[PDB]
Design a protein around this ligand. Structure first.
Ligand code: HEM
Ligand code: HEM
Ligand code: CA
Lengths: 152, 148
């Protein structure tokens, strides 16, 4: 099923603001069920043709997985050099700098919010982290409170 | 009143205020009539709150925001034609950014900030960020409304 439309609008807006305000080239959010299973994937910074070429959506593997069990923020300067990295699939843009956070409400997990490749070639900042966390928290509020499906 | 909602709305106000680096931030939630249902804020000391006495009714620029729900971003709130004025003992405030707190179906209130640091006006960036936070608040309110 498609995401509830208000939830989707809210999540795309949160991803866009996060991406813009930390000056990331790419931004993404995975929306999960309560068991960390990826349900939806919201992103920006990649053109449609490149999206078609990559083909398959992410499974929430590699570095992204770390955000789920160690729910504190993670910054890396060369994300795919991390030993948990699965690697980029064919056609995916190479990415180096990373800032990622879990999306939570209290102790419930709702997904992940992560950004890559700060445009000045610089590492993500402390201020960037704090902002990203606040956005994630807002995202957790949206997902937790989102309208559940209803038959006509 | 609702305590877990109230705490959610306060967290959103805190996020808007601190991230934009405003001195003051508020959210007002109204009924279909416009009776206030929630008014949460930060940046003003309890002593000044008592001095003001009466709660806002949602007039002036806020009223405008209720009437025409779209972002409103001003160098000087007192200079807007729809400005009603501050009551006695209210802290002076000058720069203003307000956005609706809403979902597609309905708008429930207004999230608003004043007096960005160093006397600077609120930016487009600030406005977009506040809209994103407000939207999350809008979902939380909608969910609460859904109570029978
Ligand atoms: C635009 C925002 C995006 C960001 C910030 C992002 C970031 C990342 C990162 C950091 C990794 C893993 C590095 C590692 O652990 O090896 C990854 C892997 C991956 N990405 Fe992306 N990516 C984005 C967009 C996309 C899109 C649009 C697609 C597909 C349409 C995609 C498909 C994949 C796949 C299949 C993997 C392999 C790991 C997995 O299955 O989870 N990505 N991405
Ligand atoms: C701290 C966050 C606050 C902000 C950002 C804020 C801002 C504002 C603004 C922008 C106006 C409209 C001015 C105009 O239209 O000319 C206003 C008016 C008003 N304010 Fe505040 N305010 C805050 C807190 C308070 C508090 C704590 C109270 C007292 C309980 C209060 C009481 C009022 C009253 C009575 C009005 C007159 C208009 C109306 O009734 O809605 N304000 N304030
Ligand atoms: Ca540091």
């Amino acid at each position: 099923g498609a995401m509830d439309p208000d939830l989707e609008a809210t999540l795309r807006a949160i991803v866009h603001s996060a991406t813009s305000l930390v000056d990331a080239r790419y931004g993404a959010m995975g929306v999960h069920d309560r068991q960390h299973r990826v349900l939806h994937f919201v992103y920006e910074g990649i053109d449609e043709e490149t999206v078609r070429r990559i083909g398959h959506l992410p499974k929430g593997l590699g570095v992204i997985g770390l955000l789920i069990e160690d729910p504190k923020p993670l910054r890396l300067d060369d994300v795919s050099a991390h030993p948990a990295s699965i690697g980029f699939p064919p056609y995916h843009p190479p990415m180096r700098t990373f800032l990622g956070v879990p999306v939570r409400v209290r102790d419930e997990s709702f997904g992940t919010l992560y950004l890559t490749d700060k445009t000045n070639g610089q590492p993500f900042s402390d201020d960037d982290e704090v902002l990203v966390q606040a956005l994630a928290a807002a995202a957790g509020i949206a997902v937790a409170n989102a309208r559940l499906y209803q038959q006509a």
